[PDB]
Design an enzyme around this catalytic site. Structure first.
Site, PDB file in Angstrom:
ATOM      1  N   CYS A 132       0.859  -1.172   0.000  1.00 13.34           N
ATOM      2  CA  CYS A 132       0.000   0.000   0.000  1.00 13.34           C
ATOM      3  C   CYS A 132       0.899   1.227   0.000  1.00 13.34           C
ATOM      4  CB  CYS A 132      -0.928   0.004   1.213  1.00 13.34           C
ATOM      5  SG  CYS A 132      -2.085   1.395   1.278  1.00 13.34           S
ATOM      6  N   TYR A 233      -8.295   4.962  -3.555  1.00 12.11           N
ATOM      7  CA  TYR A 233      -8.435   6.242  -2.878  1.00 12.11           C
ATOM      8  C   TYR A 233      -7.663   7.288  -3.660  1.00 12.11           C
ATOM      9  CZ  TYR A 233      -8.835   9.710   0.849  1.00 12.11           C
ATOM     10  OH  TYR A 233      -9.125  10.840   1.581  1.00 12.11           O
ATOM     11  N   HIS A 433       4.494   7.481   7.946  1.00 11.95           N
ATOM     12  CA  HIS A 433       3.643   7.276   6.784  1.00 11.95           C
ATOM     13  C   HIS A 433       2.360   8.088   6.827  1.00 11.95           C
ATOM     14  CE1 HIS A 433       0.463   5.047   8.796  1.00 11.95           C
ATOM     15  NE2 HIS A 433      -0.119   4.826   7.631  1.00 11.95           N
TER      16      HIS A 433
HETATM   17 MN   LIG Z   1      -1.618   2.953   2.653  1.00  8.23          MN
END
Ligand SMILES: [Mn+2]
Length: 490
Positions: A132, A233, A433
């Site tokens: 991700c 997203y 992150h």
């Molecule tokens: Mn992510």
């Protein structure tokens, strides 16, 4: 994070004995001494400001004090459990956004010497959504150019998601898993410049689709049904603040108010399945290699093991799949922008600024106690942040350091950071992150001025506090702040 522990000791403690194992190294860092949890091979550290420090030590006492049901696993404890893994070097490190997760804490980094035969690889140290990551595209448009047509842009981007831009047969997927962004390049869904501004050039070598189960491959094949899972997203953003003008200039960010698009995706269920099959096979082979862990969710195999070799090859394959998914979103974002403004994508300067992962394990050269070593760096919920003049980062970023993209949730700001020499020294080139944890939203976002297209209505440590903590520690440097004007989560 409760009853996944084996029957073990060190659990007959109170908050004051746990505070004995804790000492503050400096203004923004704390030390976890050995003995906090059983079998610690190295020490543990986490990075805090005064706000995040309060939440970390409150979460300790809430579980440590007990007096009630739960036994919830604090992030401080999972850090130490990771420090009890064979092969670890330096220290297990909690970034400012560290919060509890499967085995490893989300935001807890640890690296293993690949010349140590007892060194292991932990899927829980990578995450279930393998690779991700975030991708930032720049545009030549200004907020005044996009603000009028933001609803049409968001709708066009939402309508572009469902439709061959993604591997639609198992044969194409086997190539995508092996080639990463090189598949998208051949198939026309990616530009060459996207590869040069992508972590690992959008392809991790030695990926093996034969190490990806058939169920995993079908989880990654497109389904017109079950759309709305939330794996896509996107965010149309506006440059709200520039802390480093030269770093922004090298990224093509010429002034405040410039429009950018942020893409957030991963391996969907393919990575979830690849991580799960490995965890099962590792559980059955941990005995054969006599690996001892404090948490069953820290299930790991030795790097030399057949099960350890299979996971890394399958993990690399899922990471390739994740880059293909973000390249296809880039291709569809470029097409959405091309149609609304009625031009070509290149004439809008829709180039990739950068692309980072934050659910991956990487083989990297690092200096440990004056000795160059080859380390398997686990980063679940953490971003690689190479320093300036690293020979393997893009030439465009040789003087700025590697761009770091910070994910912003709905209505939340996003940040672009740069790598530092201090972060390479202290955290093996690792930084945060994003944010951590521990119709009403619709009208709030609309009143904020954010257009929103979300498929299903089913869809804290402040990101600002987190990035400011990293900036003060010197393990990252703030460059850009971005404000959303359109959020597309389908
Ligand atoms: Mn992510």
């Amino acid at each position: 994070t409760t009853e996944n522990l084996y029957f073990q000791g060190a659990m007959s403690r109170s908050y004051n004995d746990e505070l004995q194992f804790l000492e503050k190294i400096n203004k923004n860092c704390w030390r976890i001494k050995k003995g906090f949890v059983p079998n610690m091979q190295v020490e543990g550290v986490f990075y805090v400001n005064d706000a995040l420090e309060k939440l970390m030590f409150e979460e300790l006492r809430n579980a440590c004090r007990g007096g009630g049901v739960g036994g919830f696993l604090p992030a401080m404890k999972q850090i130490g459990n990771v420090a009890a893994l064979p092969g670890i070097v330096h220290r297990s490190i909690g970034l400012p956004d560290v919060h509890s997760g499967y085995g490893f804490a989300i935001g807890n980094m640890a690296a293993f010497d690949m010349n140590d035969p007892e060194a292991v690889v932990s899927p829980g140290g990578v995450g279930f959504d393998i690779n991700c990551g975030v991708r930032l595209l720049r545009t030549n448009l200004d907020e005044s150019d996009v603000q009028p047509v933001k609803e049409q842009l968001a709708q066009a981007m939402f309508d572009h998601i469902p439709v061959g831009v993604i591997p639609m047969n198992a044969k194409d997927l086997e190539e995508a898993l092996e080639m990463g962004v090189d598949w998208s390049l051949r198939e026309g869904y990616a530009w060459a410049e996207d590869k040069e501004h992508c972590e690992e050039y959008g392809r991790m070598l030695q990926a093996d689709p034969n190490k990806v189960s058939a169920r995993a491959k079908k989880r990654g094949l497109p389904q017109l049904g079950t759309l709305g899972a939330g794996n896509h997203y996107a965010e149309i953003q506006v440059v709200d603040e520039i802390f480093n003008e030269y770093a922004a200039k090298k990224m093509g960010i010429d002034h405040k108010g410039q429009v950018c698009v942020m893409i957030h995706s991963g391996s969907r269920g393919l990575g979830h399945q690849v991580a799960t099959d490995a965890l099962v096979a590792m559980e059955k082979a941990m005995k054969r290699d006599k690996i001892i862990v404090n948490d069953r969710q820290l299930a790991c195999a030795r790097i030399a093991s057949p099960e350890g070799q299979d996971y890394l090859k399958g993990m690399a394959a899922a990471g390739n799949y994740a880059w293909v998914n973000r390249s296809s979103m880039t291709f569809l974002t470029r097409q959405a922008f091309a149609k609304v403004f009625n031009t070509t994508p290149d004439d809008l300067d829709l180039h990739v600024i950068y692309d980072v992962s934050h659910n991956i394990a990487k083989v990297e050269q690092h200096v440990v106690d004056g000795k160059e070593r080859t380390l398997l760096v686990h980063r679940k919920g953490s971003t690689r942040a190479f320093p300036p003049h690293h020979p393997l980062i893009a030439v465009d970023y040789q003087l700025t350091g590697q761009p770091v993209l910070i994910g912003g949730t709905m209505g939340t700001c996003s940040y672009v950071l740069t790598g530092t020499e201090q972060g390479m020294t202290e955290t093996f080139g690792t930084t945060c992150h994003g944010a951590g944890r521990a119709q009403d939203v619709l009208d709030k976002l609309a009143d904020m001025g954010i257009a929103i297209r979300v498929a299903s209505p089913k869809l804290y440590k402040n990101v600002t506090d987190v990035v400011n903590t990293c900036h003060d520690a010197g393990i990252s440097k703030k460059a850009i702040k971005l404000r959303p004007i359109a959020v597309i989560k389908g």
